[PDB]
Amino acid sequence: EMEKEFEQIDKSGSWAAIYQDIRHEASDFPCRVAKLPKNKNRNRYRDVSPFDHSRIKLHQEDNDYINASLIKMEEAQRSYILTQGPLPNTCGHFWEMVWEQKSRGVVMLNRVMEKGSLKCAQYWPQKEEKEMIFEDTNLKLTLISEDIKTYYTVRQLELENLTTQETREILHFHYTTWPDFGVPESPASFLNFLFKVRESGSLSPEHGPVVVHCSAGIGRSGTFCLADTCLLLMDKRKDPSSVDIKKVLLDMRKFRMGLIQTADQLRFSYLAVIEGAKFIMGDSSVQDQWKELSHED
Numbered sequence: 001e002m003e004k005e006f007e008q009i010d011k012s013g014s015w016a017a018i019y020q021d022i023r024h025e026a027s028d029f030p031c032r033v034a035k036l037p038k039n040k041n042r043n044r045y046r047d048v049s050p051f052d053h054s055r056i057k058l059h060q061e062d063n064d065y066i067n068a069s070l071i072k073m074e075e076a077q078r079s080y081i082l083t084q085g086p087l088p089n090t091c092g093h094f095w096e097m098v099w100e101q102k103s104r105g106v107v108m109l110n111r112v113m114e115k116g117s118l119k120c121a122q123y124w125p126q127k128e129e130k131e132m133i134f135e136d137t138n139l140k141l142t143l144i145s146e147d148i149k150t151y152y153t154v155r156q157l158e159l160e161n162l163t164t165q166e167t168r169e170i171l172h173f174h175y176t177t178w179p180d181f182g183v184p185e186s187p188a189s190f191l192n193f194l195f196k197v198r199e200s201g202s203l204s205p206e207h208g209p210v211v212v213h214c215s216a217g218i219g220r221s222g223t224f225c226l227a228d229t230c231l232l233l234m235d236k237r238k239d240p241s242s243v244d245i246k247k248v249l250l251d252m253r254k255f256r257m258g259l260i261q262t263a264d265q266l267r268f269s270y271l272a273v274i275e276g277a278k279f280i281m282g283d284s285s286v287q288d289q290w291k292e293l294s295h296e297d
């Protein structure tokens with residue numbers, strides 16, 4: 001069991017070692033495109049880039065480049081776009097990717113300001129009188145409404161392709177108490193947030209892939225997706241013990257670098273999947289309990 005493993009690792013405090021092993025073993029593929037000097041100002045961090053083999057191309061003839069990757073989890077049969085928090089000049093490219101990629105959901109795991117510095121553009125309307133229009137990719141976005149919880153806010157956004165005037169509904173899940181390079185307050189809060197996403201349809205295969213982002217698109221986002229896919233996988237077999245959390249991590253590793261940034265994120269991910277196993281193995285009432293402990297309201 002993964003829980004035996006947890007306590008093996010814990011009892012012999014070797015999270016850091018494990019996680020270095022992971023860093024050890026993770027894939028390295030070319031990012032030639034990211035590093036074209038034309039794309040400099042499309043990348044928020046020198047050292048966080050999309051592999052070429054799995055980057056999202058924009059369907060624009062001018063420059064198809066965005067710092068985003070398609071994480072494609074074939075056995076789980078679940079796929080995600082991870083991306084950095086939008087720069088002031090790429091809010092338009094972000095929404096072009098949501099449009100072409102036909103996503104229903106966007107998961108933000110960061111604040112615009114973290115630790116004194118600006119992590120991310122304010123890329124969505126904070127208020128419904130004040131749409132945003134993105135001139136360069138020709139898209140309208142309007143706040144249609146929000147549901148503010150203590151530790152997260154869900155928003156209904158309308159997104160409009162100004163060229164056809166066709167319209168889509170986007171849900172935006174903003175977790176607001178997940179520290180940069182940190183873990184959530186508890187497994188209950190994270191699982192309550194994850195399960196809000198699931199419930200919303202946005203992780204379901206009649207939509208394009210959910211868009212997940214932090215500021216770099218790697219630490220917090222990796223953690224979200226790792227826990228989600230492990231729960232998916234165990235759910236399909238009802239077999240907790242055929243789930244190798246570290247193998248799943250390195251599988252996601254093939255499609256975008258540096259996923260899960262810290263050993264406490266690794267440990268947190270185990271905690272989240274171990275807890276969530278409760279619900280996946282037929283204790284639906286755990287999900288209530290989550291909502292309760294999480295103090296959502």
Ligand SMILES: O=C(O)C(=O)Nc1cc2ccccc2cc1C(=O)O
Binds near residue numbers: 180181220
């Ligand atoms: O939000 C996150 O967890 C995340 O991935 N952050 C980061 C990951 C980084 C990884 C490598 C280099 C710079 C990074 C910078 C940030 C950052 O936010 O400052």
